Amino acid sequence: PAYRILKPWWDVFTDYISIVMLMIAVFGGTLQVTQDKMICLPCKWVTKDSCNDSTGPTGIKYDLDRHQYNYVDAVCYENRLHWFAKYFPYLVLLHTLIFLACSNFWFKFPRTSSKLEHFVSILLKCFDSPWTTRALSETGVLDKKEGEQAKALFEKVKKFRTHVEEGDIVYRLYMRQTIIKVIKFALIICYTVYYVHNIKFDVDCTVDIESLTGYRTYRCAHPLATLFKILASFYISLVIFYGLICMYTLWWMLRRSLKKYSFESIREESSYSDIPDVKNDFAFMLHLIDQYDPLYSKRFAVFLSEVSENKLRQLNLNNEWTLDKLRQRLTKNAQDKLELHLFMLSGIPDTVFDLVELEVLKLELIPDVTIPPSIAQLTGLKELWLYHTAAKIEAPALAFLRENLRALHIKFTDIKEIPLWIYSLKTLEELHLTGNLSAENNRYIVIDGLRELKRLKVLRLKSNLSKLPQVVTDVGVHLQKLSINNEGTKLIVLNSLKKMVNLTELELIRCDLERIPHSIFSLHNLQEIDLKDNNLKTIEEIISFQHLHRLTCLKLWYNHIAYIPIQIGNLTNLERLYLNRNKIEKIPTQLFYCRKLRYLDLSHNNLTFLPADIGLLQNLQNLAVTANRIEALPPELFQCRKLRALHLGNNVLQSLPSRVGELTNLTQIELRGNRLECLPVELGECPLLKRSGLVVEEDLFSTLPPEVKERLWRADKE
Template sequence: MLRMGAMIPVTEFRQFSEQQPAFRVLKPWWDVFTDYLSVAMLMIGVFGCTLQVMQDKVICLPKRMSLPNETVPSQNTSEIMLDPTLAPHANFSPEPVVHEMKGLKTNLDLQQYNYINQMCYDRALHWYAKYFPYLVLIHTIIFMVCSNFWFKFPGSSSKIEHFISILGKCFDSPWTTRALSEVSGDNPEKKESKKPNLNISTLESNLEESHSLRSIAEKFVVDKPAARALDKKEGEQAKALFERVKKFRLHVEEGELLYIMYVRQTVLKVLKFILIIIYNSNLVPHVRMNVMCNVDIQDMTGYKHFFCNHTMADLFSKLSYCYLCFVSVYGLTCLYTSIWLFYRSLKEYSFEYVRQETGIDDIPDVKNDFAFMLHMIDQYDPLYSKRFAVFLSEVSENKLKQLNLNHELTAEKLRQRLQINSSNRLELKFFMLSGLPDTIFEVTELQSLKLEIMNNVTIPAAIAQLEDLQELSLYQCSVKTHTAATSFLRENLKILRVKFDDSRELPHWIYSLRNLEELYLIGSLSPDISKNIALETLRELKSLKILSLKSNLTKIPQSIVDVSSHLQQFCVHNDGTKLVMLNNLKKMVNLTILELVHSDLERIPSGIFTLTCLQDLDLKDNNLKSIEEIVHFQQLRKLTSLKLWYNAITYIPENIKKLGSLEHLHFNHNKIEILPSHLFLCNKLRYLDLSFNDIRFIPPEIGVLQSLQYFSVTCNKIENLPDELFFCKKLKTLKLGKNTLSLLSPKISYLVLLTHLELKGNHLEVLPAELRSCRNLTRSGFVVEDNLFETLPSDVREQMKLE
């Protein structure tokens, strides 16, 4: 046997069946069994090949043929030669006594015998008797390659390696133990000192009995992890595992390459088994010990007929029958595998038993190659699938994320992130987190909470600890609330901002916030319910005063009419969608601020004229060309701010003079060419913006506006400024940039309160020294070209720079 091993070592064939030890979890019992059968058949082939090499194949002797004139000694002669005492009684002439027995003389030397043996081995011996061990070896290698090919093929081996890697880490993760312990009723943080969990000992015994992943098993048995609180590092590792499992599932569920390869290699083994049984059964009888050999080599040896003995025929015959037995068992096992493959739905895998056993109801079923590998794992040990399923559960993932959040965002860190928002409240912002950290409820001074792009956020009952919380902002967040949390928000929330893209991001509980005062909604609210989100009734919002909608409305929803009687501010910022049917505005009798922005309005809505409490009207970015309806604004005696900016208005009607209460007027970004003098009869104006028009001349009547503090005519075509402009001595901001001015009057010195002056973009060549009288004007508030600034006296320049 040592010589045999030295000639053809079995280790040379190891590469055909060798795979990573971790891959054993994907080898069910039949694959393990057939591997052992392959080893037995391989030994038969190696043993036969070694005999072929080490021993003589056949031994041949020439067969003497009787010639007509040749006398063959009779039996009596032979007996006399053997027993000389019979000679006297024999009936023939006396011959010399032979005392030594001798065989037939062939007159052949050793080389001739070797030549005869080789010729007879090649020509007389049946091919099956000669090549039997090589056939066994080849067939066995093919079997071994078929059994392990899917572990070697690049397209499948990468998936398998990735799956085994993830499986091992999921099995070994402390989070798996914690999750399974929690659903079984154990509290991992309170029961550390109690008796070790029986599940752990069961897992250890299962691991020892089933010889699972070596590294996993050894670590699991040695470390004996108990259900305990995870530290930050373990939490991060488990979080990364969840992401890997998600990506792997998406990748593997797309195809069924592993399943197809395993089916094909199994079918190939069945077909090969049938082929081997058929031809071997017919050829085994041809392995005979005695063989007649007739070769025409008489001119070299003197003989033509030989009688040969196949020295290994008896052994080969027994080995062949033994080999057939092994192949039969191998083939029956493959047939069983084929039945398992074709009569079970292996491209779908249900975790129903895991859901029932663990109570984790959201574990999804899987399909295709992912399902097939889990079926294979179950044949090895179902425990792997159970522990792996923990990382498919969103509930489990959310619990882990919550744990990591609590580690990362402590109460002290959250206090450091507090800021004062535009409402002068202490605000805390969270962006793209997996949930709310429990530590936030320890920051009891919190007044405003802002959440952006956060999915499946749950607001627990613990929010009631934030007694000062009055403002909540939800930007693209899907939020669920505990019943107690909803009750708290209903009583305490004053301001709510919601930006949504779908119905899940518009919480249903907003309709019950009876103490809510301000509601800001950003999202699609078109009446086309099939494509957008319908706004339900706001009847319960009895305290609502401010409602702002950034949407694509075509009309005012009926749900808004339900709160119209107590609304004080109503803002619609459309996306360019035409807003029609505005008669419902009449019902907002207490409205003080109205904004209808970017709503493609061509006329001023008539419903506005009855809003006697209106103080601020903004019709920005519409399609207004004529504003003759402005005459009706004289009924709005409290109107102080009118914003008609970013439209297509070409002229200002004479009736503008009737709006005597106006203090702020915005006509910027229109197409106005002429400023009517009656505009300046609105003598209470403090803010007048006429920038970005086509105005060429400013009437001297502007001097009437003694309350004017802000005046802008930037980006027009003005060539000269009336001296009366400088009689508006309360002016603090004067914007004259981007015109065609060639001279700035020295009367600029009258504007002693001026803090901002813009002259850049004109044709000025020199600046008046009288600017020294504008002592509140600094260099930062003086917008002019540098070279033009240098024309000022040095003392004036220094004055502006110092201040």
């Protein structure tokens, strides 16, 4: 089987010694059974209960028959022959049996037999493991299944180490076996040496049988005495060898202190400092194997180490996410940037850094990531997204990011999930925070390091804030763009916003303002204002926007704005005006004094008509009145020569005015959902219009002339 490896040289020697001892026991026993004779002749002249030893010679006549001789031989054997000379083979058999019991007690004892078989099974599967030879040769692609096997093997070795290190049972069994062997060898050597001299050939008995034989004493020969003395001396030699071997084993056990196995030699040779010392009953079996072979312990150490487990995980990951699969999976975001999205992986594959074309890296739900120093290979990396993925960084990686990272996106479920090293970056221009960070009695404590971003320009917060933090006010002295998305939670300004005089784009989305704060007018460099979803109802404060001489875009959409103040005519610099999803029912004529206007979106309002002053907007380029009650478009609308789009969908339009063809810059027109009976023939004289550009019901489109329809199909096809 496989138990030949748990036997050291000394156990093998003792096994063979016990076999030889058992052989001489059986030989002596069969002799003592089949011959076992004394031959006793009476002595006629007796001196002090001893034989006096005092025409040719004639034989002496004792007048004894065969049966009287048999009786005296039996009596003198029973009484005067020494018990050693008679029972030597049975003593030898008993001693060899109890020696074999001491040897195999731990093999037959189930409590330790289970441990030994488990240990040998695990060691066997580690020795033949394909990853062992690979890892020791390396000092590269593998099967996924074999990697799963190796991971299961690491878990198995973890369980084995947990179960065994508390044992202290196999070691105690071996120690007690060897102690018993030593004491028994000492005792048997003692008594056997003391008594081997009583195996004499010639014996004398004075057995007091004279009423049965007439003679007092007898002189007897024990023919098997010399063979038995030879066998006994051979046995004392064998027991001496057995005892020397057992004393060596006892000294080895008492010397090495095998409750602790250092294991550090291989951990230094193969450079695995994460190979700790194994404890009692786990050190011992390793020592026994080391006696058989250190190679098995070498193959076991790699599965016992922690760093090798990490390398195995990395190799499985590289097998799972190769360079080809990653490059094929590479996509582009909406920002015309090359980005890679890693979602729910055990770690960062080491092959992602061989794609030097990357610019944005997204790490979402990747547990316990360490930012490898290999990120230096990503020369062109500009944005790193850490979504529910806290990153532990090293000094080289931190130094690289301090000079190569321009935008950082952090989405966290908890304060602790925010890396603390991200603030130390100095070239960082964009910080995107997405998560609730409000705290009680320690509000705005985590992000105090925000001031350290001296190059910061874009700061977007989506953080359930109830007031603009003071640290943000300090860091805003160098900001260009601000974006706060409280998700409906009210935000308080209270004169904490005017310090960002360099701010040029301010967004207060879902901040529940309920009224435009006066602090917005103190940002004279502001160029875009986005106040989406703030429950605004009165926007008469826009008269103060004349202070902002550089205001070009106004997004007041997604509010409950009931009316457009006529004071909106004073915002002469407006080019984009977004007002959709509001309660506006009519368009004041003052709104058309903003001649520079280019984007005018008034969708999803309660409008019914367009004032004729819409022809004043020569720079109109987009017009969205989607989902309105616009009965008919005034012909003055077509005075907007460069109108490049028209969103009239979901209206109550009766007939499309025929002047639609004059819009030669018209590229996209939407008309779906209208009660439009007929289509104009002048729709066919828009050079840039295609069938995709025109949005209208197919059955209504069937009303257009075949020439116009064919021309539109030809333009849309190519």
